[PDB]
């Protein structure tokens, strides 16, 4: 790895983000391609024709996650989840998920957890010393958004195979 003071450290860091971003994206595709991995990460599942929760409830969450630009915005998503949880009829909309409301709470509030789900080995993808710690602190919110977007797309397109018969 480059010495931290090295003059090409700035340029190298542009190469790193690119390699990390595209790695996160490709892994999010793979993880979203299986229904067991979608249920593990968000609790989202198919029950015959039915989606747990309905796609409208996933769209509501996904519309709030668009506001997760940084970890200073995780209060926005935790605001949404507490409001959802505080309304009994909306909470019940998420029963028969595999604990999906708390899985969302965790992913938004445990910074390591997106990386645990992605489980990318970033060593082939970093060259700056302290590259992994800084890029994880930098790309966290984008990784969360990227994984949930992929999961919800793979969910809906597996739902279409069960629903459109």
């Amino acid at each position: 790895p480059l010495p931290t003071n090295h003059p090409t450290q700035d340029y190298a860091r542009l190469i790193e983000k690119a390699a990390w971003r595209e790695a996160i994206q490709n892994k999010a595709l793979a993880l979203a391609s299986s229904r067991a991995k979608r249920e593990e990460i968000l609790g989202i599942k198919i029950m015959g024709k039915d989606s747990q929760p309905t796609m409208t409830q996933l769209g509501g969450f996904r519309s709030v996650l668009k506001r997760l630009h940084s970890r200073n915005n995780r209060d926005i998503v935790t605001g949404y989840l507490t409001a959802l949880e505080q309304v009994s009829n909306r909470k019940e909309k998420w029963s028969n998920t595999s604990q999906g409301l708390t899985k969302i709470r965790n992913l938004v509030t445990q910074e390591n957890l997106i990386w645990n789900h992605l489980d990318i080995d970033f060593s082939p993808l970093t060259i700056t010393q302290n590259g992994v710690n800084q890029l994880k602190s930098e790309l966290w919110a984008e990784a969360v958004r990227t994984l949930v977007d992929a999961i919800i797309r793979g969910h809906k397109r597996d739902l279409e195979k069960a629903q459109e018969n």
């Binding site: 983000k17 668009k66 605001g79 009829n89 958004r145 977007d149």
Partner: protein
């Protein structure tokens, strides 16, 4: 090397006068169409995209003469032209303050059901408005002086006539040049070559060349509509709020947020009424067609545009796509807020709690909830269960109705030159498209076209108090369009002109051929 009598460095600030979208390969997990970014990840205008914007405009200015275009922009195949004499650099975009990119929602509305067509739900990342980027232009002159066509180009930039990026008809792409500077280096001579190396060049007074020339603005018609909302008007924001479920869409307009009616929205309502008129006359149903087929009907394909779609006709291969001659610009309110004042509203949690200060702040009436709520009014709505009365479980929702937001005029731009090209030069073929457009404006003025969210549900009715038709270099028989209309029924246009249009309109109705087929 290549001989250069004088090298010119032409530079200034280009400002986004509307939002902007140059696309990369596409899609960033937050937008289906993602902005182009340089290797540093900064939003930028590719010099390719600006070169073709300026070459394209110049191609229309110079009546598509290949000779003078290739004299300035080079040619791969002529044996004496090769490389371009205009260098266009990649220019990074400085979004004002550090405003983030906006995401703009899009939907196709099924023409039979009047509702979002399946699959036709999309989003585009757009550069705000007010954002600046460099005009990175260099010109190597072999002739003496500076070309007239290049002076005309710089005039069009300062006029704001060139459009850049995607969605040019659907709201986006307007740029304006400010602070144009011309630096000249006589690379043909010792003193000018050393000036290139050391002295940063001779400053030319642009105003002197700007005086030597008249700006040859191409034929266009511009329609500006003055509307006040009769019933609240608002496009829905991208997602449900906390204290208010349904909030108006806002955009960054400089350092402030304003309420926006996307031009994509004004164009889809105008297109929908335009198509409904055409289908009504031909008695042509839209229920069996899919949404891409529903859109594709005569006159609107030229005015509003059609999707690119290469089709083998018979051996010959033809693009059915054409850009819209009709372009609509996003509309903005008289009413602006600081980016945090609106966040105070979006992040309010109790309608009678912290929302009240947020709306009092954002409306500019911090001490008059009454005056504040004559501008932005929260409205509660219930669905009432039909056996019990009361309210249906869960079916309680709230709208922030912009009951008293004041809006700017809607600005439509008809590229008469683009239409005339579709009609292969025949100015007589313009009259049905003009007649349609005036019929669409008659309906708009008569409240027949509601705009935005909730049109059937207490919102979206507009009052049109003035339409100003203001075309430039119009063909002589279309010149009676140059009128400020205030009667909704077009009776401010000369009756002999409305009868002439009606005659050509009726001639087309009698045989509604594809008017750009020849």
């Amino acid at each position: 090397a290549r001989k250069v009598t004088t090298r010119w460095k032409i530079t200034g600030t280009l400002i986004a006068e509307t939002p902007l979208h140059i696309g990369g390969v596409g899609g960033d997990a937050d937008t289906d169409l993602a902005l182009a970014v340089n290797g540093a990840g900064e939003y930028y205008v590719p010099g390719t995209s600006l070169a073709g914007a300026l070459r394209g405009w110049m191609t229309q200015l110079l009546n598509n003469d290949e000779s003078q275009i290739k004299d300035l922009w080079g040619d791969h195949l002529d044996a004496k032209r090769g490389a371009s004499f205009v260098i266009v650099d990649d220019a990074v975009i400085h979004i004002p303050n550090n405003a983030d990119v906006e995401i703009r929602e899009g939907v196709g509305i099924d023409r039979h059901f009047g509702t979002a067509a399946n699959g036709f739900k999309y989003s585009r990342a757009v550069i705000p408005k007010g954002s600046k980027f460099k005009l990175p232009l260099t010109f190597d002159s072999q002739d003496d002086g500076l070309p007239n066509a290049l002076i005309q180009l710089l005039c069009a930039l300062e006029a704001g006539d060139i459009r850049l990026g995607a969605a040019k008809t659907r709201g986006l792409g307007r740029i304006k040049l400010d602070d144009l500077k011309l630096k000249s280096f006589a690379l043909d001579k010792p003193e000018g070559i050393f000036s290139a190396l050391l002295d940063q060049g001779k400053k030319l007074d642009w105003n002197q060349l700007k005086a030597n020339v008249t700006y040859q603005s191409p034929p266009y018609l511009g329609i500006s509509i003055t509307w006040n909302p009769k019933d609240p008007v608002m496009v829905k924001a991208e997602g449900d709020g906390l204290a208010i479920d349904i909030l108006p869409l806002v955009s960054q307009v400089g350092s402030d947020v304003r309420f926006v009616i996307p031009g994509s929205s004004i164009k889809g309502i105008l297109r929908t009424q335009a198509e409904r008129i055409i289908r009504t006359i031909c008695q042509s149903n839209g229920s069996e067609k899919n949404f891409l087929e529903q859109l594709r009907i005569n006159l609107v394909n030229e005015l509003f545009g059609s999707a690119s779609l290469s089709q083998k006709q018979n051996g010959k291969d033809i693009d059915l796509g054409k850009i819209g001659a009709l372009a609509v610009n996003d509309c903005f309110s008289s009413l602006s807020m600081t980016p945090d004042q609106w966040k105070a509203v979006e992040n309010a949690t109790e309608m009678t709690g912290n929302l009240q200060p947020a709306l009092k702040q954002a409306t500019g009436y911090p001490n008059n909830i009454s005056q504040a709520y004559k501008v932005l009014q929260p409205a509660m709505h219930v669905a009432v269960d039909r056996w019990t009365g009361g309210a249906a479980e869960g079916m309680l929702y709230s709208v922030l109705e912009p009951i008293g937001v004041t809006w700017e005029p809607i600005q439509v731009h008809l590229d008469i030159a683009r239409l005339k090209n579709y009609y292969h030069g025949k100015e007589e073929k313009l009259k049905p498209a003009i007649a349609l457009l005036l019929l669409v404006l008659r309906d708009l003025a008569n409240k027949k076209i509601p705009v935005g969210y909730g049109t059937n549900r207490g919102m979206g009715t507009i009052t049109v108090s003035q339409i100003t038709l203001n075309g430039k270099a119009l063909p002589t028989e279309l010149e009676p369009l140059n009128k400020t209309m205030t009667c909704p029924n077009l009776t401010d246009l000369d009756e002999a002109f409305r009868q002439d249009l009606s005659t050509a309109w009726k001639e087309w109705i009698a045989d509604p051929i594809d008017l750009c087929q020849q």
